[PDB]
């Protein structure tokens, strides 16, 4: 019985012995404050005051985000760590049935126990929970293409009529999870139906540390982890890792440590009592495991590694100036708080080595998020598919507070050929509108785009999208050739001497470009390493 | 139940008597080490230690490669020599149906036995295996495929929700084979769903020698193979051959000999070098 003193409810929902360190979900910390204030705060105050304010409780919750982040974990923990009736779990398309009027009945049967208990008792009914998984499967926008059978509308209408209708009900809480909130109906996301909506993003570095400490907890307290494992270093090494890949990393390290004793296969499959009572996972296991789990958000970093497979030979002095300018621009975008969009153009003669310089700058920048768009990735697709790919890639870059994008060979992304001239207007317009849209509030971008047909871009009237130019002239003197040959190991010192001496006599205003020079050296290494072959090739190519 | 018990599992999952030399697959040695280390390594150690480490087992295995190079063979051998339950085979698009809502009910019926046995015997359950064949036929990227009635999205969502959902399973192992890995959905390859991905490729010279050795075995011990046949030379002449082509070569030479003999000369039947060279 409630005494005179205003003491908390008898059968509370959250109880007073609760703290966010007991759930077991690491990383997200502000989201939990928001969720636990908006929804589970009006069910703890004594019923009298909550009745004197004339407000009803919120009856909906939506969680959305990328794949492998923690949505279902939150749903599970919320469902089975409260004081309420058991959840009525429903998978994605687990509602549909074959007969004419059985799908809607399946959606109606979820609410009946709650209705009965609310009718019988009133405001003392225990909380009920039902959780919809993969919400974006059946509940799509009404009147859209698809669902030729008349099922896409009846289901949505039934759910709308049963969540806020002519008969009231305020002892339920329905929770839904999805990867795409742009397809859920528009009448399902208004106050009274799915009020609180929360986005769950990739973890921060300190978030990665928290997740790592959460996963390796039973391992540490049973004395099964070595003393040379430093979790901060592991958080540092993992860049594009989501919550669901740290688990894979830990379990791969455990497999490496296990496999030494019972060597599956071979003849060493015999378990020895001594060495399984002294098991210990060490640092080398984690470092080896780092080679198994490959993050899915960091594929482009491998292509930016491939781009520079030829190495940055610091011949000449102009290279250092270009790299310094790139570093300056990266620093400016990092520090300034008003410049939220910086775009560059890197133009020069064909074969001069632009993509390599752009890739080098981007790699040495050290940003969390780096991507690259190239003709290779778009081969064979159709126009609509290409536009869709470009739009998706540009949309993925609007999260996080620091971003870098490398657009390669602009003139060949629009199918240019000078006979007509022919080209694609749609792709050109899409890029022209994409390179001037500021990202959301509190974000920054740095777009570096290379080209080799400066004049064509001038004619199209697209030279206003960019902000600053960087020219890359090709080698002209004859000492640069000597430096390249020294760093390529073509001949002995004497050989370089003879080749340069002879070339002096039959080569005025030497002008080739590095990409061709390296190929000529490579092919000349077989036929006649003496002067003749290299001189002939460099004369015929210049 | 539990306590400190440093003794092998009650009903081990692999066997007391096993060795790669008798599996029947030749030319792939590194791949098998990787597979058996990552998948079947945590199912052999005593349950007490695995419980202490706070680990869960791997619930997927995808393996891909060009045509006719030994993928279905591995899927068959794994599912028949592991003291496990009877495999649940679904070959091709064998689930689609023409009644609304009955297409995915076939995907939810493959897991019923595993759930039923897990709910009763928690961690003493036997291993259940289900083999998906031609995985790329139905489980394409959701949202990109051409318009229709909306059955592709429902199938993909049903499998996604059943493989890793709000109710946990620790008995299931699911295997998938395909020739075009690019078409598979992006969310199915996340760790925890299809964690271990392996590639099977054309063999090199030693691989070709091993395949030849394990194909012509029952005709080498029955004393039905001549003494002038040398498998090293044959492994050297056949270049860029696959496993299926070597099997075809063997049975073609056998047919040559059998057709040649054609009353009771069958007692002396013997395959010779000339038959192999004509094949």
């Amino acid at each position: 019985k409630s005494s005179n003193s205003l003491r908390p409810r008898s059968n509370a929902v959250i109880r007073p012995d609760f703290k966010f360190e007991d759930l077991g979900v690491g990383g997200l910390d502000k989201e939990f404050t928001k969720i636990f204030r908006r929804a589970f705060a009006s069910r703890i105050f004594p019923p009298s005051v909550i009745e004197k304010l004339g407000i009803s409780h919120v009856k909906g919750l939506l969680l959305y985000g990328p794949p492998g982040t923690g949505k279902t974990l939150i749903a599970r923990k919320i469902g089975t760590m409260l004081n309420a009736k058991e959840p009525k779990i429903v998978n994605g398309p687990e509602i549909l049935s074959k007969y004419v009027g059985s799908s809607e009945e399946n959606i109606r049967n979820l609410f009946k126990d709650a209705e009965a208990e609310y009718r019988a008792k009133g405001e003392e009914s225990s909380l009920h929970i039902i959780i919809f998984d993969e919400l974006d499967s059946v509940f799509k926008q009404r009147g859209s293409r698809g669902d030729g059978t008349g099922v896409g509308d009846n289901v949505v209408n039934q759910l709308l009529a049963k969540m806020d209708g002519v008969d009231q009900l305020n002892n339920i809480l329905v929770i839904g999870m999805t990867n795409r909130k742009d397809l859920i109906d528009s009448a399902l996301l208004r106050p009274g139906r799915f009020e609180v909506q929360v986005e769950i993003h990739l973890p921060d570095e300190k978030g990665r540390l928290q997740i790592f400490d959460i996963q390796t907890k039973k391992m540490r307290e049973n004395n099964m982890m070595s003393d040379d494992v430093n979790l901060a270093e592991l958080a540092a090494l993992t860049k594009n890792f989501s919550g669901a890949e740290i688990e894979g990393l830990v379990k791969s390290a455990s497999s490496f440590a296990i496999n030494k004793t019972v060597n599956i296969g071979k003849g060493a499959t015999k378990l020895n009592t001594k060495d399984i009572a002294k098991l210990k996972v060490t640092r080398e296991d984690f470092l080896n495991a780092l080679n198994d789990v490959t993050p899915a958000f960091g594929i482009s970093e491998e292509d930016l590694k491939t781009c520079v497979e030829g190495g940055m030979m610091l011949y000449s002095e102009r290279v250092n100036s270009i790299l310094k300018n790139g570093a300056r621009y990266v620093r400016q975008v990092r520090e300034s708080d008003k410049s939220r969009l910086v775009s560059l153009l890197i133009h020069g003669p064909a074969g001069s080595g632009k993509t390599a310089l752009a890739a080098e700058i981007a790699l040495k920048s050290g940003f969390p998020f780096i991507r690259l768009i190239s003709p290779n990735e778009l081969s064979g697709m159709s126009e609509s598919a290409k536009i869709a790919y470009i739009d998706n890639t540009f949309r993925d870059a609007y999260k996080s507070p620091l971003n870098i994008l490398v657009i390669d060979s602009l003139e060949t992304l629009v199918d240019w050929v000078p006979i007509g001239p022919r080209f694609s207007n749609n792709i050109l317009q899409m890029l022209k509108v994409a390179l001037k849209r500021k990202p959301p509030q509190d974000r920054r971008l740095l777009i570096m785009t290379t080209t080799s047909a400066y004049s064509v871009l001038q004619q199209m009237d697209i030279l206003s999208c960019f902000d600053n130019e960087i020219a890359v002239p090709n080698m002209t003197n004859l000492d640069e050739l000597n430096n390249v040959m020294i760093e390529s190991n073509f001949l002995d010192d004497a050989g370089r001497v003879k080749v340069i001496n002879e070339l002096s006599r039959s080569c005025p205003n030497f002008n080739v470009g590095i990409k061709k020079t390296l190929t000529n050296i490579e092919t000349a290494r077989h036929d006649e390493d003496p002067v003749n072959e290299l001189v002939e090739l460099m004369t015929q190519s210049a | 139940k539990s306590s400190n018990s440093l003794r092998p599992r009650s009903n081990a999952v692999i066997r007391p008597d096993f060795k790669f030399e008798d599996l029947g697959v030749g030319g792939l040695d590194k791949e098998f080490t990787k597979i058996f280390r990552r998948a079947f390594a945590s199912r052999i150690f005593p349950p007490s230690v695995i419980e202490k480490l706070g680990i869960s087992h791997v619930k997927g295995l995808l393996l891909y490669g060009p045509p006719g190079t030994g993928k279905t063979l591995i899927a068959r051998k794994i599912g028949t020599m592991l003291n496990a339950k009877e495999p649940k085979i679904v070959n091709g698009p064998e689930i689609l149906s023409k009644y609304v809502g009955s297409s995915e009910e076939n995907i939810r019926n493959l897991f019923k036995d595993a759930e039923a046995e897990y709910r009763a015997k928690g961690e003493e359950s036997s291993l259940h295996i289900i083999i998906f064949d031609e995985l790329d036929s139905v489980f394409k990227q959701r949202g990109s495929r051409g318009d229709g009635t909306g059955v592709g999205d429902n199938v993909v969502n049903q499998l996604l929700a059943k493989m890793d959902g709000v109710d946990q399973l620790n008995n299931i192992l699911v295997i998938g084979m395909t020739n075009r890995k690019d078409l598979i959905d992006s969310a199915l390859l996340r760790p925890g769903r299809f964690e271990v991905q392996v590639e099977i490729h054309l063999p090199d010279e030693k691989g070709r020698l091993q395949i030849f050795d394990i194909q012509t075995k029952k005709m080498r011990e029955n004393n039905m193979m001549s003494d002038d046949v040398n498998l090293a030379e044959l492994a050297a002449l056949t270049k860029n051959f696959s496993g299926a082509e070597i099997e075809g070569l063997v049975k073609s030479a056998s047919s040559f000999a059998i057709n040649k003999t054609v009353t009771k000369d069958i007692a002396k039947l013997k395959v010779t070098r000339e038959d192999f060279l004509n094949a």
Binding site: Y99, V100 | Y99, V100
Partner: peptide, 12 residues
């Protein structure tokens, strides 16, 4: 690309 429902009659 078509699907179908189904209805049911009782016994005579």
């Amino acid at each position: 690309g078509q699907q179908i429902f189904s209805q049911a009659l009782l016994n005579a």
